[PDB]
Symmetry: D3
Subunit: 337 residues, 6 copies
Amino acid sequence: EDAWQDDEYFGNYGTLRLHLEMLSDKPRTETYRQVILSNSAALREKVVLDLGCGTGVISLFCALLAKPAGVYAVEASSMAEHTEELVKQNGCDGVVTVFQERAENLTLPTKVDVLVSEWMGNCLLFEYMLESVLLARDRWLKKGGMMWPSSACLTIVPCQAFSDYRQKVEFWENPYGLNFSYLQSLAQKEFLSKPKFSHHLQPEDCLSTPADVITLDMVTIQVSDLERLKGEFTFTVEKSGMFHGFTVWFSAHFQCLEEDGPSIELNTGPYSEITHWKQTLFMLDAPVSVEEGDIIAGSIRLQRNPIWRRHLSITFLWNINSTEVSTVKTKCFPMWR
Amino acid sequence: EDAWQDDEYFGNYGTLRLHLEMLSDKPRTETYRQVILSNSAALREKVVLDLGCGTGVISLFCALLAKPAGVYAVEASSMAEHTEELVKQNGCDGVVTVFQERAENLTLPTKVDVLVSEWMGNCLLFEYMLESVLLARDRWLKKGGMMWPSSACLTIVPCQAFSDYRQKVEFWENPYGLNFSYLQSLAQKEFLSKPKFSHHLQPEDCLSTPADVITLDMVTIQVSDLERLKGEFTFTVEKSGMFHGFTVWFSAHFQCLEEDGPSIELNTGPYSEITHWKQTLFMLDAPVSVEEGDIIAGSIRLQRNPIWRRHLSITFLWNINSTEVSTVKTKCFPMWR
Amino acid sequence: EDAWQDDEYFGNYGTLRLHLEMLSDKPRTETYRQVILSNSAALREKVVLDLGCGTGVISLFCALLAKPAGVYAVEASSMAEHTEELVKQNGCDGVVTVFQERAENLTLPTKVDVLVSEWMGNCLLFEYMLESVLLARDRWLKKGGMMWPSSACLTIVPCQAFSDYRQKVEFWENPYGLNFSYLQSLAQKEFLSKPKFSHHLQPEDCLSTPADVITLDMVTIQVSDLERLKGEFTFTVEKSGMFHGFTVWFSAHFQCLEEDGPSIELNTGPYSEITHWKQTLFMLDAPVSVEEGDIIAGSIRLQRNPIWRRHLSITFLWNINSTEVSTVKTKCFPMWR
Amino acid sequence: EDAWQDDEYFGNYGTLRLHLEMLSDKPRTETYRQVILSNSAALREKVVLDLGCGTGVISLFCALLAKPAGVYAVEASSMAEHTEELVKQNGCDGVVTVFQERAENLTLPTKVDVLVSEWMGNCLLFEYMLESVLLARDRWLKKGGMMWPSSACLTIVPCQAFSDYRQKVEFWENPYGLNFSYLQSLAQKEFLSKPKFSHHLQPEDCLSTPADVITLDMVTIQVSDLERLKGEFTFTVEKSGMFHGFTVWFSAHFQCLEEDGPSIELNTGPYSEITHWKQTLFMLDAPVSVEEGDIIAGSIRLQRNPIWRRHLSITFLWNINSTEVSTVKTKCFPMWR
Amino acid sequence: EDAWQDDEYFGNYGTLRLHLEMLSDKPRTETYRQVILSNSAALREKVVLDLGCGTGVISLFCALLAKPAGVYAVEASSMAEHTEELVKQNGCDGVVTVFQERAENLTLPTKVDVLVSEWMGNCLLFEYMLESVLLARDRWLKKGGMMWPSSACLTIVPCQAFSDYRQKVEFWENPYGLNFSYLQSLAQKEFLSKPKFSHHLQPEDCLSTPADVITLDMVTIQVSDLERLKGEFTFTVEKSGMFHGFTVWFSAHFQCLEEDGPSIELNTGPYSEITHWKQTLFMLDAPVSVEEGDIIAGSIRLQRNPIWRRHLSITFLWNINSTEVSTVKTKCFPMWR
Amino acid sequence: EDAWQDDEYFGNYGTLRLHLEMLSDKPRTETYRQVILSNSAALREKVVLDLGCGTGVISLFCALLAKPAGVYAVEASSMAEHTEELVKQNGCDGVVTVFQERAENLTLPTKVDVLVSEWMGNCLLFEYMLESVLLARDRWLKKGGMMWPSSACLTIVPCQAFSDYRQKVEFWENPYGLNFSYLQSLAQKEFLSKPKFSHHLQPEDCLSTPADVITLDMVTIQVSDLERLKGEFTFTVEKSGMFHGFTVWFSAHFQCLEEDGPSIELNTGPYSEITHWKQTLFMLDAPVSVEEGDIIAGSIRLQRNPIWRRHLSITFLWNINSTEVSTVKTKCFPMWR
Ligand SMILES: [Li+]
Ligand SMILES: [Li+]
């Protein structure tokens, strides 16, 4: 709870600021509402566990847009005290029970048919709320029950970012006519060493088609699998341009409760409506100019921080039109420790 | 050990201050001595685990007022170093072994026939030493063995407290002729929002007969049960008076080792000799005047803090002569976070 | 240096982040460059003290766009180590001397003819670098010497902010059809209690013409004057609209070294090019609808925090079409403690 | 402000708890009210500085029970925000101005005729608010002006305290029949090493008549004098009894504004009505039995802590019926560091 | 990870300082290299887990001085990022895989045939890296697999240390002719109360032959055994001299993978080449002069700290030519809390 | 007292450890004793201020080896409590008065004829106790009075340190046959970036004769002078060898109270008996081989840390057989922030 930094994590969720940003995310919130809508009939007399309910929005969707047997809304932060009043004021305190408890030390009156949760962090895994979700799945989800989302994908693409490199590195060349170029090394180390949250990747700055590189099956994935997640990639560049680095985002997928129904997707990428996650930019130390037909191949590794359990390091290995050990570049981005 | 705040908890017990207050509590200490006395014969050749022995007083009662096979005195604080000398100076180092260990990571040479411990916090559960006690019971207590105390009760009663309300809220009306009434809202928020430890409830200020609202069976209760403890209550007011709030206390019960013997009680309530726990007062934001025949019904919930594992919140729900949802009042007291 | 929080203040300036934001502010940086340009002849053989030179940009303007006798560039943060290299790489280490010292404990080889500094914080005074500037003026500026800026103004205007009130307060009414209105009180307390940095006030949202309310003469102002700065205001509303609160900004003025020359202004308000300061928004708890001819009169007080010497509280008193004590509203905004 | 621990000192005064204890002290508050009453005529058109006004009670006494020209109520804690409303609600905002400032960095519109303050700490000096008072006297009090209190006295007496020694030291001899005497050395070191705040000395436990040992003239005393305050004492014991140690208290004296009037005293000793300060007990390591005619002579030293400027150490030197260097005992009590 | 103080423990290993001291220890590093050499043939196609590989030295010995199937090099500190480059630069990235993970939450692709680790702390157990080693053994070591070291011994001997006692205690008698003897009690408490790391015990200062007092079988020892380790000792003094206290060291033993091969030892005692551990000195409060034929008998206890899990207390019980309870001395040394 | 870190500075001096190291320094302590001896007659009826007396050793030298009128022994740490007993036990409490006060807020009964103090830190200035000494000189030293030491010198010399460079940088080339050379850059940054305290420079490793580069006149030096101390140097190398860097030490000089007497020196350099200060080594990033007749010229700057007032940075500028701007190297060593 210290190397999980639980006081700070859950303290940030006791304030309205973070909830205001989540409910203002329309693609994110309306996706969950449509999953409940699209599955309303199948959810009747089911028992739902809303893990990390926050203000309770997903629980109210279940209770008001369907007729389940019961909904267990679980929130560890102080916001749970208000959730209890919100479900009362929306006429749902006969269906929704609110537990101010952590998923880890959770006691529910029965097992559940569906576990629904909005746990995705930056680059899917940041803050590792996924670990809580999986612990509660193992203890409380019935065999054959539903996980919502049911799978999740990490997608990447080699990209351009002239805006970022010129304002943070090439800016120092001649501002107002002065030679501040000596600061470029420290600009490199301070600005390009860390990932850039809330990057808005424009479609015309993709140098290939994005590829899913990691996929998580929410029914089979084990907590031990999250220690070290790695995927392979190969890209053939389709526009001539400048390879400044990689942009990353995720997708969440929601299987229909019934065989015959189609899946619902939450896409945080550049061809979908922007979300509060936006995309995440990882810049190379030095840009390299590419041209159509070039191949950028390698791997991406999401290595969990062994001490600070809410953090991870993302390591890129890549190669340009070569398969040799000596042309292989690497770079490691902390997120955040 | 950080969200258990073990350095501060066990640091406070390394000082004589807290032990002086425990041994100065005669009802508390003499009760344990009489349990050993009243059960002396049955304890012969039994093995006793004194969990959290402190100065070792309960262990010395066992070794000197009975003839057990062995006594394991377990103390995690630095006071254990002195316990070892105290048992030597009282001629008991052939019977009593002292382990400077936490109950949680405890290795004893054999299982035990009796687990005796003085673990009760404010309103029974504050600081949740009960969790340590139950872990050690599961690992070290033999099947059929004794838990002392064997059960524990939480008792409440609707009460008066003119002293408290006038000195902390109505004081501000006209002190020395000045109108300091603007401070009443902040008096309400600062003084009446938290429980008052060491309240001495006078018998003439009970507005009904006290009722046990929660009961813990020390043999069957599970650690998972302590996350959320709730009880129901109904009171018919017997004196006309003013309902300022509720007073809370506990009882500990000690079953005889032999069928035929009677139980021994440790009562911390207002009709028993005062203890170092006294009673605990929970005041309403605004007092309400009641009269004989009125019914005050509702529930009390002891919800454990999910982050700070030594803390909890106590939530009261109550209703006066009505059973409707819209006349239902609630108030939540932190203890302490 | 603790209630000045100097380790955090100067630590933030050892990183390129804050310098990148200052040099990217073109109105701010080009104003200083034009002051040097417009006064180039008058600055010859003058001695300049650049107080808090940062990267050294103002010092390089002096040394390269004029021919002073000497420039003393004073920087307390670790960035001074790099300033020394930057002035060398720009061929100015014969004119510019760099001192890694605080203004307060500063030893310069001679007194100076001009003290130039960019000290303005949010609402002019936030962080009170003005105090350092005035101490160095008293110890090191020659009688008759120049202060740049030579005066500074705080300007305010009653404003609209539909965007802010609807997204932070009225949002909770019916998001996705749920009644989250119970959270409005906590939205009020969390979002509207503090000033909003980096507000971009649109001209069509001014309900009157802005008025300078406080003016600082950099030659006569004393450090003791900064404890409590107060100004009076009266506004006649010119558009019908909704009075959500007040927007605040500042101006810095630069007198010509020679009688005959005109002053140069740095305007951070809504009718000037946007700066890294933008404007600062102070919202009322509840909006009030106004119409042409209405008068909003009162005062604004900038009260320095007695303990945390980089902080202050801004208190608004105002009245609408009345001069009576009982229609007088007040509200106090911390910035930040 | 760190070795003054100003955040904690002034944070404790932002809460109603400490103000409730001060206004509940009737001898303390009514003394100040009677000083204003007894001097009402002489205070007309005078300017009063209420240093550390807290809730503003002394300022309201001045404005309502006299007709001064103006009252400056100075409070560094956040309580000042409420003081401003309290003086408005009591119809005094034409006479009383409230400054949320520290005495040290204080700017008042004029000098003052009377400086009235309630600054006394435990044993007069604890927390050294006296230093603030003297700084403000030097900057703001007119020549010939009044200091209220005008002098202050520290009084001591050799005493008995059977209650304290038996419960904290001799208790360990045979509690419940166990030999816990090994803990006596640690009882001595933990309980008798520090002064005991809120001791209530009974008159029958004085072994001589109390003597003033230190006297402070509020007009002539300098801040440099507070570093090290020392007084001499000789006592002839009048009852036979046991010398457990010394009890200490103080007096504050209030000279009449006019020659012909008598002084008003605030006595915190054992022959006066009890105050929130009570008295302060300093126990010897070992008690010594005394009998009528014995002389206990020596000194008491109030040595200010050089690092933690709100703290001090009190050192006792004493001798019983001897004047030799080798029978001279010493003991040093921290308060609190 | 807080009562394990993992941020500080693993932060110290992210710096080269501690690795420089380990690789500069030739007896320590060459022992591991010779274990790999002496067992090279038997290690072919085995899978090795190097637990806590640091710079990776043991892993490079395995990969370069033998031909295993694979080596898993596990390092929780930030040094792992460099380990990955070092194994690449030494041509071993086909055999050695580097995991930046804690042993506790470790996921390896297969089980292992040999677990090799250098975990020994001061007096063998300080910092309790042994706990990590045993957890990884239980999860990842195949039945019948090898532990390196395979056993470990704690050795002690009664010793002389004139140097230490004269410089730290008897020094104060007459330095430069002044009588500073009053400081001896505080010298005793400050200097002799704690163990002395990096003591270099000379052979002529042993008063008997050293004896192994505790032995750990790395295959059978359980984590629960480390809570409290105790051994017995008897010494007959062989030189006449002064008994200042006890010196302690350890041995690590490495069984051959094949029955027929002999064991390899790492000896940190006084008759072996000095290591970075040196020896550890525990001084008595007062020295006692001994003569040939005297018997010093008792026990040594390594009691783990229940709160700070990297720490322990070492308690000595001893007796000189007597077997009586009243001649039995004890002394407890913290290491370090 | 926070950016002076007074709690840690003076807390380290409350322990015997640092006093044991000072009194064990014979050259340091005997020098002060001989200054008192050599000046015994001249000190009769003089008043001496021993600033920062510690255990009181210098005060006892004055009182026992001379007959002054009075000695004021001033110590801010808790050790002062023991100093008072030590002067009593050495029969000097009629001559020596002990004040537990900081020099800064010091009140002495009279001015003094001699101020004697042992204030020298590493490289003379580290920890800037010199500032306290100079403040007390200005307030308490009579005109014409003596400062002991009366002057102080900083000496430097270009040096060799094969031991240091090979063990910390070249070690990584081939330890045990592995190529750990990739770590050399981080060895450079971690080991050679900071000064090395307690370096023992051997005479045969001086590449020229040492030169005093900075000199402090204790009568004329002002506190404002300590902000930035700079000296110039030129060295002609006399042995052929390798220029690894510079070694630094200091001298303290003690003028005779009488014209006719000679000065006494405390030399901490390599040709004098070693002191607890030893010497301080500053290594270049890369060594350069020099030969007889080469000139190494430049400057050394002791720049005080503006925030952490006990710290400084030492900046070296140097040039080898050239006077051009482009062959000029620089390197800055923190000490310690
Ligand atoms: Li922690
Ligand atoms: Li601080």
